[PDB]
């Protein structure tokens, strides 16, 4: 029987080089493998323990002597019983011939089908091994810490272009007709980043510093790829220069996989992407589409250094490389594509991370992983964005040049190595001398949530106090504290608060103070009574004495504290009274977000008139801006992003000029059979307005089912779901669940849109209750999809009756179903809504 | 101090003979000063007179005897729990002797509309006017005056009331003496009454006008607010007609010299049968031959018949205890339909009786049903008897007894029962004893107790084998087991044999199994003629098919009552699972040749229940498939309908049904034809004639637009026609704008633009259709405490709200949710009759879906 019994593999045997040959028939979903694993023992062992799942092994041989396999499916491991005691430092070669099936679950070595522009059934195969799927494709030591070289050999038919990490060495025609493609030996790399593609593609290539960058897409979609290649070159030159370590490989391939459930990964030389995420069109694709494609290439590019070159010893440190890439996603962009204004997106991404972090349901970023399912739990965007946030707090604290130095030093000292997060902190610790220890970053990582810094200005000294930001414990953080002050003197400095209480002596007496410049520090600031009123006043006099980043932080910070009671809700609306003099998109959108949250929460309770007073108040503040808005695309990215916001708010709440302009624009587009171009920044608005009439709805539906453009399709879906006809709404969720007119993938987005407004509110949660089993069958538990379905449907419930109902439903399923992340998070949200209403509903009547 | 009476019921020892009540009510202050002079007699020996009194502040209590002018002071005892007051007598009450008890008191005129209640209303001259009336049934008389508040304790009443010169004061008996007092007030005195029950005493102090007609000796009169005395012509005309019928049929002339009917100017006003002072809510008596519809004409005719039949059945022959309340209430409900077929044959009210009976049969076949005759002990148990179910089942038992025996034999036993027990208190069994004088004792009415004492009704399975008709009997119970369940079933049967030889008869299944010897072989057999019998009839496969085929050949070989009974039965059995749903739709495939209203509305009812159930679940193609199939049959009947008020009441009702269905579903013309009518009515600023039959159909069509909805909302708050106001409300609640629908419910609960009384009708209308199905149930859950504050726990309203919002749920997820909500309220509330029944209903729906939902795809 099997000898080793543990999740992780023994440290005795170590892989050096991998010789993998695969013959996959794409029409059928089978593949014949041949793995020659060249290892070296370090400890005296009689057996080799490594991973293997869906494999029917023909002959297993140790080297020439045929060995034997032992099985352990619980850990997904296999054992080879050696004829001799494997001696220390001795190289050994182990061959395994196997039979396996090409995956359908879009995981590991997967396969699918599609229809060409010529309407011909075409086959395609690809890989997605992160975190534990490499073992399904080939028997191997599937652990990141087990870096080795890879010689990959793929047998394929003529029509198909076979791809892999490294460049192709030789393509030889076999006697059966099939071509055997051989690939250059890989650099020292972990099993998970190993990739191989088999598909009928076309290319778009641009050479740089001998390294050939190419974009692989389906021949019918090789026209939209043009922007992506141009972007990749720019960012590759940026990264190679920033990190000061040249890109290792002689090729860099980015690939648009022709499926919507495609596995998008940072594969070393074979960057995978869902077809849609790279298709940019300079004439139609909006600012949302330019920023999205630009963000994705930059993310999977920063991974080539932070995740491929320098790899984590184990998954418990995944937040580091995913956090580092997400920071380079926003960093590199503000350096080379400065006009995009991608900081605004990071600022909003940060704001959301903070609300999900404030919850008792929150989890600390640095947490030890041992369980099989605990590894897939590390794949949440919360850890990635909090991780990215604390690298911004670090980068802003110590110089931009001091930060880069430690980055270059870490990548050099760890090139082709496996690390623990602390090794980046150590690389930082060499500040030219060792100033502060990295127990600071350990306060942030090791404990859940973030802090509330309480400022009190008394003359020339500002009394600072920190505490756990909780909604309702001895929590202590090491916080850098940036701050700007005002005979019109603009002074800014930084201070480290390591203790529960502190103070900052000022050079001169100042009128206003704003702690946390551009919110760069992952915290919420609460000023004392007269200090809130100081900024509130200044915002009304001249707000430009502060940045848009600084301004939107006060808007978010006042509106968060208003929920928790440290500030009354009247003060939140007293701050935003300055909006009549706001022209920069970042604060305007944060206000509109905040106000829309209060609106819907109120509306769902049925305070329809009070809720409308909230929107007539906000409209009266954004009236000039709303009136000044042009129904075009002529403007800077941030300015056309503002256009979309302002026109979506006024048209949603049917405010003066709006609806009629959109309705006129809609009727014209309809008469023209949808052939007459509409500005993209007004598209969704005009569509939403038009779907409010049976004729327009039936028209839009008919265009959604016909059109090519997925970006336009999404805008049509959002519109069709914004309708007030509950029968139309129900049918959408029904038809999407069956995959009738809409893919099951767009279902979550529908349920989220349906339940956002009064007609479909109860309907969406009813749908989640009645189709729970079908939903759980189609999307597994813990799935991103099932987590937004429960959040989308329940979030706007603000009654004890609703809380009892949500709780009762989730108990009646399973005890494992009630004790879930998304369930216990949703129930915590309804409770907080119940609380926000008891604190803040009373007053409202009298002042809105 | 120690009370001498621990029991609920008053002792038999002291019995009242005469009461002399003097009252001075100040309607502007809603307070009254009273004086009672009870002439009692002792049958047993006692030191304490135990009677009833609540809300009273007693000043002086004095006691007299036999041949003594002098009044001895006596002390009162309190016991608020049973509403009782004990009088500690100075002299021992010696059996046989008569004594006079006198009590002077102060009290408040009721805030609510129970006992001696008061209210104000506005004039046609924008002036405020005060009014007072009574509602003593069941335990309220004790709130107005200290008395022996039990229906058995019967006495004569001398009521005297001091009122302001402008108010017209009324009571049971005609006025004897009105004498102007020195202060400018009038002291009205009414002649000594007949031997009557305490809950039947009445008096009204109101500024009203009259309309009178002297039928023989009796001056019948209708009293109303001066501004609405013109609309009581039909009311009187009808009352005079029915009074000739009842007196003649009962063979006992009305004992009073006058018969007064009054339209109380309040919506909540206590509507009852007080001898000679029949009270009714204004709304229920106002009728106009032009502006009013069919239901309106029927309602006012039925409500007059009911309160009138009660003068004999309830007033002249009252029941000893509240446990026999179903006897007189079912008898008045039976005369409500009987008299109307006798006089008002044109109304075709037999159709309304059939439907009521169909709806009774459904609620009575649930496990939550309780037998009509069950021991009443407390006030809660007394109020439990005030449900229309015991009345309607009772009405159905009397129809079955009238049909089994002759119409002439039913009349003999009736006249016999009244004559013998006139001015006496009765036990339920005395009616059956009078019937047992059948020419003598040919059969026992121990048959009737098989019906009264059991819950539900029987399922009768029939099997034809040559010239032998095999009968079986079992409790019609819906799945989800005691064998004491046996009924003495009167079996009416109709057939056809050689050359259309139409034969009919009766048999009595007093055993589990039986056999009927048929004359010859028959092409078909039909059991329970005109559904006179309170039961369901199932058939063996071939016998069901024989009737199904005959309905396709010539269905008029059967009555319209028989034809609607078969549509009910097949569909009911299809629920239980005794017949596949395929058979039910095969029977109704005969409907292409159906011209009678009764079968059409019943087909529609059963079909609208499936549609609504399928629609609340996602099955919206099946739901449309069902409606297009029904439409295909009824096409001509829909197409032949003229948008008018022309024709007989029956064919008028048909038009309303056929066109209401056709617009609801939007089938061809209907909608456009209604929308044309709506626009024209809206164009004339709502000052144009809409035919009452097509009115609601027209209103609903317009209400589907923001323009229409708003025009209608404006007309609701403005106009006076409460009948038309209700037609507008149904339409406003028929809207598909979730926001408009919520606003309606929220408003009626805060009493904003719609009064709180209409909330239950709103909640039910919102909930019936997809847009507001979840919205109405959510509203009931969220606003539950205000709902239960406003309408008490156990009221008809709260049952109505619970039924309406839930009945369309057919998922286990929905069933758990409903349970959980009520379980989280209280286990005292979760154990209510209406909640248990609500969950029972969902459970039965889930079972109906699991039985018939899957095969439905393949047909319709
Ligand atoms: C184990 O195998 C590796 C295979 O690469 C051997 O490494 C090579 O050693 C030769 C000298 O003997 C060098 O010229 C190569 O450059 C080495 N290659 C690499 C990538 O290391 C290694 O010597 C073997 N060890 C034993 C114990 O035999
Ligand atoms: C998968 O196996 C099938 C075996 O049928 C191969 O199909 C042949 O494909 C060529 C084109 O490359 C056609 O011209 C032949 O007609 C096909 N053969 C038959 C018998 O239909 C296919 O090439 C195999 N693919 C791989 C990658 O091995
Ligand atoms: C697809 O990729 C190939 C390289 O793999 C590109 O081939 C080069 O093409 C240029 C001209 O465009 C020649 O000067 C080079 O000598 C070619 N190199 C090789 C290795 O063949 C090809 O251009 C790419 N396709 C497109 C449309 O850009
Ligand atoms: C109720 O009591 C009031 C107050 O004593 C009486 O009010 C009088 O009403 C008449 C009209 O009905 C007026 O002309 C008088 O001026 C009122 N007087 C006062 C002082 O308000 C009323 O009459 C009493 N009613 C009864 C039935 O007793
Ligand atoms: C019912 O209305 C009639 C209307 O006429 C009243 O009758 C009049 O009564 C007065 C005495 O109150 C007589 O002097 C008149 O001669 C009667 N009118 C006629 C035409 O005969 C009658 O009093 C009213 N009754 C009640 C109690 O309201
Ligand atoms: C491959 O698929 C077939 C079904 O098509 C299945 O029976 C077989 O077990 C699969 N192979 C492996 C190794 O699981
Ligand atoms: C495993 O592979 C061999 C290849 O020769 C095949 O014949 C055999 O059927 C496979 N085993 C199973 C259990 O499918
Ligand atoms: C701040 O001022 C206080 C005296 O008010 C003094 O104790 C402290 O050392 C000062 N710190 C700095 C850094 O100026
Ligand atoms: C917003 O207005 C201020 C006014 O001082 C100006 O400095 C700023 O440039 C304006 N922003 C834009 C985008 O025009
Ligand atoms: C234009 O309208 C026709 C129907 O009249 C439709 O078939 C066609 O697809 C529409 N045009 C385009 C480019 O889709
Ligand atoms: C009702 O009558 C009593 C006297 O019997 C009195 O004390 C009480 O205040 C009255 N109720 C109200 C509501 O005034
Ligand atoms: C009525 O009210 C109170 C008792 O609630 C009492 O003080 C008052 O004197 C009573 N009135 C008479 C006339 O007895
Ligand atoms: C009065 O008393 C006698 C016995 O003393 C009794 O028989 C008689 O019935 C009573 N009077 C009336 C009118 O009931
Ligand atoms: C019916 O006929 C049979 C003869 O077949 C006879 O014995 C029986 O008594 C009859 N029963 C009735 C109820 O007529
Ligand atoms: C109904 O049925 C037929 C026509 O199909 C006819 O003989 C009969 O008289 C009609 N009944 C009425 C009341 O019109
Ligand atoms: C419509 O008629 C009502 C009276 O029935 C009146 O109050 C209203 O003002 C009328 N409107 C117009 C515009 O005449
Ligand atoms: Zn990543
Ligand atoms: Zn009655």
């Amino acid at each position: 029987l099997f000898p080793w019994a543990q999740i992780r593999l023994p440290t005795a045997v170590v892989p050096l080089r991998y010789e993998l040959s695969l013959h996959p028939n794409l029409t059928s979903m089978t593949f014949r493998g041949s793995v020659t694993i060249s290892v070296q023992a370090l400890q005296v062992t009689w057996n080799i323990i490594l991973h293997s799942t869906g494999h029917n092994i023909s002959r297993v041989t140790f080297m020439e002597k045929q060995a034997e396999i032992l099985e352990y499916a619980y850990h997904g491991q296999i054992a080879i019983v050696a004829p001799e005691a494997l001696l220390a430092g001795h190289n050994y070669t182990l061959k395994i011939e196997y039979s396996a099936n090409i995956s359908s679950s879009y995981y590991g070595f997967y396969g699918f089908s599609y229809t060409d522009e010529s309407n011909e059934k075409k086959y395609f195969a690809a890989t997605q091994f992160e975190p534990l799927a490499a073992r399904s494709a080939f028997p191997c030591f599937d652990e990141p810490a087990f870096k080795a070289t890879f010689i990959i050999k793929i047998i394929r038919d003529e029509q198909y272009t076979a791809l892999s990490n490294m460049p192709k060495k030789s393509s030889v025609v076999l006697d059966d007709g099939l071509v055997q493609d051989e690939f250059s030996e890989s650099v020292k790399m972990s099993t998970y980043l190993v990739a191989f593609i088999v598909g009928e593609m076309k290319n778009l290539s641009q050479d740089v510093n001998g390294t050939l960058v190419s974009i692989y897409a389906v021949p019918e979609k090789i026209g939209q790829v043009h922007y992506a290649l141009e972007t990749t070159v720019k960012l590759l030159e940026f990264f190679q220069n920033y990190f000061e370590i040249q890109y290792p490989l002689k090729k860099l391939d980015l690939v648009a996989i022709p499926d919507f459930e495609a596995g998008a990964m940072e594969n070393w030389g074979l960057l995978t992407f869902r077809e849609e995420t790279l298709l940019y069109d300079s004439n139609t694709s909006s600012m949302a589409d330019r920023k999205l494609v630009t963000k994705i290439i930059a993310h999977e590019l920063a991974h080539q250094w932070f995740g491929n070159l320098v790899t984590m010893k184990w998954w418990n440190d995944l937040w580091l490389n995913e956090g580092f890439a997400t920071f380079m996603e926003y960093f590199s962009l503000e350096k080379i594509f400065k006009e995009l204004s991608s900081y605004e997106d990071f600022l909003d991404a940060r704001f959301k991370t903070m609300k999900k972090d404030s919850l008792n349901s929150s989890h600390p970023i640095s947490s030890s992983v041992q369980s099989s399912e605990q590894i897939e739990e590390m794949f949440d965007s919360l850890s990635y964005f909090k991780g990215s946030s604390l690298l911004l707090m670090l980068k802003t604290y110590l110089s931009e040049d001091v930060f880069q130095h430690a980055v270059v030093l870490y990548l050099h000292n760890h090139s082709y190595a496996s690390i623990q997060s602390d090794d980046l902190w150590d690389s930082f610790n060499e500040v030219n001398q060792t100033l502060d220890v990295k127990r600071m970053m350990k306060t942030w990582t090791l404990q859940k949530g973030f802090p509330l810094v309480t400022v009190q200005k008394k003359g020339k000294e500002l009394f600072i106090q920190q505490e756990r930001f909780f909604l309702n414990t001895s929590y202590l953080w090491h916080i850098p504290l940036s701050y700007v002050t005002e005979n019109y003197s603009k002074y800014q400095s930084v201070s480290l608060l390591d203790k529960k209480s502190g103070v900052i002596n000022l050079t001169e007496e100042v009128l206003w103070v704003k702690v946390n410049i551009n919110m760069n520090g992952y915290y919420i600031v609460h000023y004392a009574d007269d200090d809130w009123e100081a900024l509130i006043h200044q915002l009304k006099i001249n707000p430009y004495v502060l940045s848009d980043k600084d301004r939107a932080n006060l808007i978010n910070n006042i509106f968060e504290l208003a929920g928790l009671g440290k500030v009354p809700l009247k003060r939140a609306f007293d701050l935003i009274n300055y909006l009549g003099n706001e022209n920069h998109t970042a604060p305007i959108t944060e206000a509109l977000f905040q106000t829309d949250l209060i609106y819907n929460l109120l509306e769902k309770l049925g305070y329809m008139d009070l809720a409308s007073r909230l929107v007539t108040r906000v409209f009266k503040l954004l009236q000039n801006q709303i009136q000044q808005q042009t129904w075009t695309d002529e403007g800077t990215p941030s300015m056309r992003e503002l256009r979309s916001a302002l026109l979506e708010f006024a048209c949603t709440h049917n405010l003066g000029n709006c609806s009629t302009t959109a309705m006129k624009l809609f009727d014209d587009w309809m008469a023209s059979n949808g052939t007459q171009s509409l500005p993209t920044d007004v598209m969704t608005t005009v569509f939403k307005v038009g779907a409010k009439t049976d004729k327009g709805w039936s028209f839009l539906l008919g265009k959604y089912i016909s059109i090519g453009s997925e970006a336009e399709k999404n805008k049509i879906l959002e519109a069709l779901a914004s309708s007030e006809d509950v029968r139309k709404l129900y049918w959408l969720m029904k038809s999407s669940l069956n995959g009738d007119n809409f893919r099951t993938q767009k279902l979550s987005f529908i349920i989220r849109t349906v339940g956002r407004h009064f007609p479909g509110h109860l309907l969406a949660w009813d749908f989640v209750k009645e189709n729970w089993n079908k939903l759980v069958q189609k999307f597994p538990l813990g799935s991103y999809t099932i987590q937004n379905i429960v959040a989308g449907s329940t979030y706007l419930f603000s009654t004890k009756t609703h809380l009892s109902e949500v709780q009762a439903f989730f108990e009646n399923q399973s005890e494992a179903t009630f004790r879930l992340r998304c369930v216990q998070e949703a129930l915590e949200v309804i409770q907080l809504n119940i609380q926000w209403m008891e604190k803040n509903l009373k007053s409202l009547t009298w002042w809105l």
Side-chain angles (χ1 to χ4, degrees), chain A residues 33-58 60-62 64 67-94 96-120 122-152 154-156 158-220 222-245:
Chain A
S34 198
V35 216
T36 327
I37 316 158
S38 307
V39 296
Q40 195 189 108
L42 306 167
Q43 297 150 48
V44 187
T45 182
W46 272 87
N47 43 54
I48 306 142
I49 322 294
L50 70 165
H51 306 113
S52 166
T53 61
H55 309 134
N56 168 43
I57 301 103
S58 299
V60 55
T61 191
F62 171 96
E64 206 277 274
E68 276 133 290
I69 290 290
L70 289 162
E71 232 282 303
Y72 197 87
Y74 190 66
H75 287 143
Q77 293 164 6
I78 51 145
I80 283 95
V81 277
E84 62 177 50
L86 307 155
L87 293 154
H90 264 106
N91 283 3
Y92 289 109
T93 56
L94 174 67
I96 302 100
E97 296 173 334
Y98 61 95
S99 324
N101 299 347
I102 293 166
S103 185
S104 184
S105 64
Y106 293 98
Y107 192 46
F109 186 32
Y110 67 83
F112 69 89
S113 333
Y114 62 91
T115 51
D116 211 297
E117 226 184 318
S118 286
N119 213 90
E120 277 153 59
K122 301 291 133 192
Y123 294 89
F124 203 100
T127 55
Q128 194 76 352
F129 301 161
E130 199 179 41
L132 270 77
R135 69 196 66 181
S136 85
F138 57 100
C140 55
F141 296 88
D142 197 17
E143 277 175 35
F146 282 107
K147 274 174 152 169
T149 85
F150 292 89
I151 282 176
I152 280 123
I154 51 181
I155 302 105
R156 49 93 177 175
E158 191 194 278
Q159 68 271 45
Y160 296 98
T161 309
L163 304 184
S164 186
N165 298 108
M166 304 304 295
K168 192 193 65 192
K169 186 177 193 175
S170 62
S171 58
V172 292
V173 179
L174 309 156
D175 53 338
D176 42 44
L178 314 157
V179 192
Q180 179 160 242
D181 291 30
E182 212 200 304
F183 290 91
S184 304
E185 191 157 42
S186 98
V187 283
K188 217 183 161 68
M189 69 169 186
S190 351
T191 52
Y192 84 100
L193 295 150
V194 186
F196 32 93
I197 283 157
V198 190
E200 288 177 77
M201 291 167 289
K202 211 187 132 180
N203 64 284
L204 185 82
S205 307
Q206 187 171 316
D207 186 270
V208 57
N209 213 56
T211 59
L212 186 79
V213 193
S214 313
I215 318 301
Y216 279 76
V218 70
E220 68 154 280
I222 207 83
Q224 297 107 295
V225 297
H226 283 104
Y227 177 80
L229 186 61
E230 190 174 25
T231 293
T232 321
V233 177
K234 277 195 178 176
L235 284 153
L236 179 68
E237 289 173 355
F238 176 89
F239 289 135
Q240 278 187 129
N241 279 261
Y242 187 77
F243 300 135
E244 293 169 53
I245 290 130

